[PDB]
Amino acid sequence: PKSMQCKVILLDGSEYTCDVEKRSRGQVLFDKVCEHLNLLEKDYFGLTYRDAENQKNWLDPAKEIKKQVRSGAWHFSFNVKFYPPDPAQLSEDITRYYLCLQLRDDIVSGRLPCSFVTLALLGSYTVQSELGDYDPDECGSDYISEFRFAPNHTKELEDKVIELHKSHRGMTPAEAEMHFLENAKKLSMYGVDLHHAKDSEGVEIMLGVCASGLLIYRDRLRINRFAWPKVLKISYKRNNFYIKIRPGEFEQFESTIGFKLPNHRAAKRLWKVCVEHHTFFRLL
Numbered sequence: 001p002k003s004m005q006c007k008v009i010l011l012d013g014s015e016y017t018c019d020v021e022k023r024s025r026g027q028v029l030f031d032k033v034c035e036h037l038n039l040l041e042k043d044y045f046g047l048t049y050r051d052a053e054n055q056k057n058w059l060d061p062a063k064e065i066k067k068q069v070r071s072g073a074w075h076f077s078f079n080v081k082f083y084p085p086d087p088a089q090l091s092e093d094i095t096r097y098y099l100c101l102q103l104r105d106d107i108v109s110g111r112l113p114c115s116f117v118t119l120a121l122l123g124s125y126t127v128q129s130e131l132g133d134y135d136p137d138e139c140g141s142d143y144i145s146e147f148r149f150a151p152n153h154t155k156e157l158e159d160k161v162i163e164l165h166k167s168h169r170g171m172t173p174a175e176a177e178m179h180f181l182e183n184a185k186k187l188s189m190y191g192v193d194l195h196h197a198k199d200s201e202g203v204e205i206m207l208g209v210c211a212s213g214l215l216i217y218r219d220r221l222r223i224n225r226f227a228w229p230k231v232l233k234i235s236y237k238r239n240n241f242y243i244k245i246r247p248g249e250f251e252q253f254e255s256t257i258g259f260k261l262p263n264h265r266a267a268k269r270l271w272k273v274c275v276e277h278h279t280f281f282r283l284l
């Protein structure tokens, strides 16, 4: 029975290697990674891979791995797929830990924009969780943490992390991680998956997919939002993506809204993540 080597980049930046049978469905590999990670609350997570166009795709756990990676390497990342709006609701500390690791990468990468003060507060909770109480012996006036906190590090930011870390004496790792999450969950781009698109007039927009619905960013001046409940049908055709809106009270007709995506694969990818979000966040 022939097996393919799989390499998975974990949220701590380390590499997990395993073998699965070459006709394996994605769930087989995901189950192995989650057992490796001692992760029970698996529903929020998934594996990604890069397609022939170097686009991030979710590995569909119900489909054969080989029919998704196709010509590409069996190389994956372990990621948060569904960001919980209230991480305090999660049953296990280790789930919140992996969600913290993902968010730290969302922040350093710039996918999750954050004010100076919130970057320093999030950083200070990470340092408290990982090193425990502030020790002066480690940090002088010239201290720079090994921890990556932000897309652009400044001495002022490092100083503010230390100032806040000092305030956290006695805080346990789970407690610090829960504070991390209570701050991060409020950020306007928390758990928003962004897709480049054009509206029905050709104006460049971003579509954001998240727990609360589909967001349209025309810029910073005028953001439209469609809460999942309103959305009856999500569809794609050629390079186009459509949502069927519920009729408003006393309106005769449903309303269908249309966007242009970069190519047919980008339209299908946006459709699939919307359908998946739509189901996930109506069902608890």
Ligand SMILES: Cc1occc1C(=O)Nc1ccncc1
Binding pocket: 043, 084, 085, 086, 211, 280, 281, 282, 283, 284
């Ligand atoms: C935040 C939210 O609002 C409505 C539903 C949910 C939710 O978390 N659903 C879910 C959790 C775990 N597995 C599957 C679905």
